[model samples]
Target: SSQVEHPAGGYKKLFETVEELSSPLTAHVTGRIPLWLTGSLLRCGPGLFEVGSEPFYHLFDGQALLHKFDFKEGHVTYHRRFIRTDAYVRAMTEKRIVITEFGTCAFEVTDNALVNIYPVGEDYYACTETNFITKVNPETLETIKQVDLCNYVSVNGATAHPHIENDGTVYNIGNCFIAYNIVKIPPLQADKEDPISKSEIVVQFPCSDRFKPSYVHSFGLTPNYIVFVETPVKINLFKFLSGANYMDCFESNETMGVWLHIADKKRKKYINNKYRTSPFNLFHHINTYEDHEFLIVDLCCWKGFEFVYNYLYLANLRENWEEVKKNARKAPQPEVRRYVLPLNIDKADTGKNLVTLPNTTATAILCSDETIWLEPEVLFSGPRQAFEFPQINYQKYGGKPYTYAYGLGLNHFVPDRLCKLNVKTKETWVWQEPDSYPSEPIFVSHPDALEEDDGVVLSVVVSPGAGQKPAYLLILNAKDLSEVARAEVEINIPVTFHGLFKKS
Candidate 1:
C-alpha cells in the first residue's frame, strides 16, 4: 500500500501537467547551452495536455511545440514557439476542439507535434504523421507556415519518419486507403527551384483495410534497400470518418502479427521481398547495417501499440503506477531489441542466438518466400526497467556497424536517465538525479572526434515539487556521463520530445 502511494506522491507534479501556452516563451537563461556546445539543439514535442481548460482526447494530438536552444562561445540563447497551424490557431481563438486529431473523435489539433524536425539544404520543417509539415526559420525558430504533401503522394496522410540519406536522398511513404506508396526525394542542391517536382515514385504495394490507415510513425532504411514494417496498431477509417477521435478509433488484435516489406533502393525494378515475424511495435530504429552475412537493425520496442497511451497519460499512469504495473498492465514501455534479418533464411531457421522476452507480443507475418521469419535477440530489455527516444551519431555509423547509442529512459518513471549503451558490449553508462527527470538527450559529437562516444550530451532536466517547476538545460561529458555545465531557467517549460542539433 505504501509503495502505491509512494510513486503517486512523487508523481503528483508529473511532467505532463504544466503550463499550456502556445506562443513565444522566453527567459533569461542563467544555464548555458554549453560553451563547448557549438550548435542549436532544436527539439519538438506535444506541447500541451489541454487548451482553454479542456484536455485533448489523446497524447499524440496534433498540438506540438518547437524549442530552439542556440549556443555560442560559453553563452546560450533560448526560444520556444508553438508551430502556428490552422488547428492550433482555431483551438486558441475558439477555445474548443475543431479539427481531426490522433486520439479522439473531436479531431481539432495542437500543432503540438509529437514527431520530428526535418531539414534539407534551405528547407526546415516541424512534421507529424498527420501528413502536414509546419515550416519554420531555422535561425529564428519562428515563421508559422504549413505544407501538405497530399498531392505529392496522392494521399491525405504520410509518414512523420522520412529517412534522409548521407547523400541527402530522402525516403517516405504515403498512407493510402488500401495501400502504401513509397516516394523518394532526391538530394537538394543550392540552385534548385522546386524540390518536389524532382521526387519520384519508387513503387506501390496493396495492404489491408482492417486498421483503416496503419499508424506507422517510423520506418527502417539500409544502404541498398528501403524497408517498411506494418504493425497492428491502426486508425479506424470508419470510426474516424464518422467523427470518432483518433486514438479512440484505433483497434489492435494481437493475433494479426506484423509485416516486413523490403524493396531495392536503386534501379528501375527488382523483386519485392517480404518477411513475417512475431509482430512488435516501435517508434525508432537507432541504426541499420547490412552485414555480408546478415541484415542487422535495432529497435526501441513497446509491448503493444494501442495500450501504451494508457500508461502515458502522465496523470493516471503516475497515480496507478504500481497497480497498473502489477495487477492490470497496459502497453508497457520500451526496451532496445536487435532484429537480425539474415540473407540466408537458413540462419533464421536455426534460431541460434534468439530468445523470447518475458511477456512477448507479436501480431502477424507475411512473406513471399513463405520461409523467412523474423525474430529479435534481447539487446537491452532491462532488469526492472526500460527506455525510449533513442539517438546515435548517424554521420559515420548509420546503416553501418555501430557501437553506441544515447537516449532518454526510465530507471523508474518520469524519465530520470540519460544512458549510453554499448551495442557490442551490452554495457551501459547512465547519468541520473534523484527526484528529477530528463528530457530527450541530444548527442553532439566533438570536432575531430576519435570514437563514436566522443561528444557531449544535452538535455533539459525538471524537478516539480508537488506543483509546476522550471527546468535546467544540462550538458554532460559523454565519456563518463559527468556534468559539464547546467543553465538555469526561470519559467517551467513542458518537456519537449524528439529534436536535432544544427552545428555552426
Candidate 2:
C-alpha cells in the first residue's frame, strides 16, 4: 500500500509513510537516522549552545502526521523536548520501539541520552555514560532499578545497543573498547533494590591498545555469538581545536576489524573456549540471519590519506570460533583469509584513485544473499555536481566542481551515480540518477509481508544542480532495480548520512 501526505500542499512541507497492501504481511524495520543537523540550530561558542525552539519527534502514518509529544493518555504526558538525533532504532517486537540519542554532561563530553519509551518490560535495560545499568518501565515512564558497572570494568564513552536472545537473555555492548556483557533485570519490587546490583562482563576479548578510544558502530547477534563493528579513533580534531590538550590525538595505524565472541548463555559467561576475529576492521554496518551467514561492509581509507571504497567481507558463523582465531593469529595477515568480493572495473579504478575518486554507499540484505554497493560512474560528473550544489546561486557562482566536496571532504573524490554490486557473483548493475546523485539505499525484508518476494529496497534522491526540490523516498523493487513508487517529504532535508524506517 502507498499513500502520501503534504503539510501545505507542496514540496516545501510534506510527510509520507508506507505500509503493506496485503494481509499476513507485517513490516518491522529498524535503523538509525543520521541527520547531522536541522535548519534551526547554528554554531555558537565552544562547548556551549542555545536552542531557538525545542525539538520534538515527528511521527508519520502514511496519510497523517503527528508530533510524538502531542499524543496523550488520561493523565500521562511527555514534557521535556529533545531530539532523538542518533542513527539507530530497534523494534524489539511488533508493538515496541527503542530509540537512542547521545547527550553530554557539559556539551563537550557526550553523556548518555535518555532512552524514551512506553510500556517497558523486564527486558528493558538502560546503559549510562557513568557505567551504570538500569531498568525502566516504559508503561509508567519511570526507572524501576539501577546497577553500577564501572566497578569491574573501564567505562569511558558508552552507547548501549541491547540484543535480546531467544531464551530471554539480554546482551549489551557499550561504546568504549569494552566487550559484551550478559545482564539480567530483576523484577520490579516495592522496595526497588538496585536493578543491576549483580552484573559482569561476559566476554573480554583482546583489543589493540593502538585503538584505545574505540567504540562499536554497529553489532549483530546470531543464536550462539555476538558480532561487533569496532572503529578506532581516526581523527579527533574537534577535541584538539577545543584547547583540550588532555585528550589524546594519536591516530590509529590499524584499520577497522570485526570481532566475534561466543557466549554460553546457560553459564552467563563467554565460552572463552571459543572466540573469532577478522583481519581488517569492518567499519559501520553488518547484517546476519540463520539460514544465510553474515555479511559486512568494511569502510576503509587508502594508506590513511585517501578515502578508498569499502570492501564487502563475508563469513559463516557456523564455523569454529577457535579455528578462526587460530588462523587470524598464525596467518601473515588475517584480512586475506576472509572472502572479499572482487571489485568491478569501476570500483577498482576508484580504489586505486586511478581516474577519479570513487564515491561508494552500501547496504546488505540477508534474504536474497546479496549486498549492494552504490558508487558514481565518475568522481566529478553532472549528477555529482548537482548533489554538491543543489541551489542556483550556489551552482552558477559556486566556483569549480572540484572545489565542492561531499561528507566534508572525508572522501578525496566525489560521486555522481549509484552503482549496485551483486555480493554473490561480484557483478555490477548501475542505476544512474538522471540529474542528481541518490543517497544510500535501505534494503528491507518484512518478516510477514513477503512470502515469495524479498522485501523492498528504498532510497532518497536530490537534484543538486537544478533548482528543484529533493525527492523523498524512492521505492525500488528489490528483485529488479525497477522504480516502484516515489514519496516526497514535505521539507528538503539535505540527507546528511543515514536513516531508519519503522512500521507503526
Candidate 3:
C-alpha cells in the first residue's frame, strides 16, 4: 500500500487501490437469492488511485475498474477487470501520469471510462464524460473495442447517461461547437452490423452563450419530447482548449439562471416557448412525463450555481463526515424538485400561474418577456442529507408518471444509505448501515411485475469499517426498502458510480 495516511473515517478504504479478480469467485450468501434473478450487475468505478509515485487528486480521476456480480441458480459470483484505456495503459507503461483528468493535470484529456456502464443497441459500453467509450463483452467482462465519438460526430464528449428505448434505440446529448446536439442510434436491425457506426445527430439546440456551454450530466426524455435543462454551471471553451484542468474549465454564473429547452421528438424541432427557472445545478433527472397540458419534470437539484465537483477531492472524501462537514467549504443544499411546464404558451395573464394541474404546487407563470417562469415544488429535502443518483423503474415507468424513485442517500458527499421516495405522497423510506457506503441503487423489475415498484433494488455495499471482511451485494425489497438477500465477496470494493443489472 502507498504511504498515504488513513483518514479518520473508514472511507479511506474507498479511495485505495485494489486487485482485480480475473476469474470468478463464489460469494457467501446471507439470504436466498431470488430464483428469477439470474443475471449480472455490471458496475464501473475508480480502482487504481495512483500510478507509480503520482496520485490522482479527485475521486473521478482513478483508473477504470469494471466489476461484475453474476447471479446464477441462487448463487452469486464476483469478478473484476481493469479496462485497457489509453490513459490506463500509458500511465502504467510510462510509470507516470500522462493524461489529464477532472482534477489531475498532465495536459492530455484522460479517457478513464470510470464513471458509468451503459448499453447501446445490443452491446455494453463503459464511459466517462468524454468522447471515448470502451465497448465491453458483458458476458466475459472483457474490453472489446475503443470508440471515439469525434470519429463519428461533431461533439467533443457525451454524457454517460443515455436513454434506451424498448426496441434498443439509444438517444444521448453531447455538446458541439455551435450547440448541444441530440444524437440518435438506430435500433438493432437485420442488415446493420453496428448501430453506433450509423449514429446521427437528430436535433440541435442553440447555446445561450456562443463560447460558454452549460455543464450537462443528464437530461429528461419522454416518448414525445426531450427536456434539456440548461443550468448556469458552464464550461469555458477557451479554458478547456488552453490546457486547463477539467474542473478548472467550469464556471458557475449564478445570474444566468436556468433554461428549459423542450424538443419535440416527432417534429424534430424545439418549441418556440421560452421556459426559465432560478439558478440551480442538477446532475440526474428523476423522471419526465406529459400529464395533460403540462410536462412534469422531476430533478435532483442543488441550490445556486455552486459546482459540486470542487468538494469531491479524495482528500476531502477520506475525512470523517463531521470533519469534512465542518472544515471543508459548504456545498449547496440538494433536494428533489418537481417543475410543471405549461405546454400551451398562448395568451396568458402575466404574474398568474398557468398550471392546470390540481395536484401540484409547481407553477409556470407568464413573464413580461413572454417567457414562462417556472417555480418548482420541493418534493424532498433534509438537513445535511441528499438523495442523488436517482433511479426509477425505467423498463416501464421511464418517461412516464412514476411514484417510487430509488436513490443513494448522501450525507454531504459520501453515500451512506439507499432511499425510496414517493413522488405523489412525498413519503420516504431508507435502508442504512453505520460506516457502510452503498453505491447507486439499480431497480430490477420482477419478470412478472404488475406494479411500478414490484421488484428489487440492488446495490453493492462496502463496509470499510470491517477490516478483511469483504464487500457484499445487497438486495432489498423494492416495496418497503427491506432486506431480501446479501452476497458477500472476500475482496475490497471501492465506491462506484452508475451501473445496470443486465437480465440474461
lDDT of 1 at 366: 28
TM-score: model 3 vs. ground truth: 0.97
Order of quality (TM-score): 3, 1, 2
Steric collisions counted per model: 32, 15, 0
**Which candidate wins on lDDT?**
3
Ranking by lDDT: 3, 1, 2
lDDT of 3 by residue, 225-250 (tens): 99999999999988877645888989
Candidate 2 local lDDT, 1-504, one digit each (tens): 001111121211112222211111111112322121111110000110112121112111011101111111111111111222121112212222222222111112222223212112343433323354444432232335443456544544333434434333444555343233333433345575433444345654444343344444334544544444333434343453451222133244354433333343444454432112233333232223222222222222111211111110112111233432333332121110111121223322432322122222221111221222222122222211112111111112111121111111111122234433332233433455534435445444444442322444445554433455444445455455566555443333322223222221
Which stretches in model 2 have alpha-carbon errors above 4 Å?
1-108, 111-154, 159-170, 175-200, 210-213, 228-242, 245-250, 254-281, 288-421, 434-439, 446-453, 464-467, 496-499
Off by over 4 Å in 1: 1-36, 107-114, 205-213, 268-272, 304-306, 318-330, 344-369, 411-413, 465-469
- State every prediction's TM-score relative to the real structure: 0.85, 0.44, 0.97
Name the top TM-score candidate: 3
lDDT of each: 0.65, 0.29, 0.87
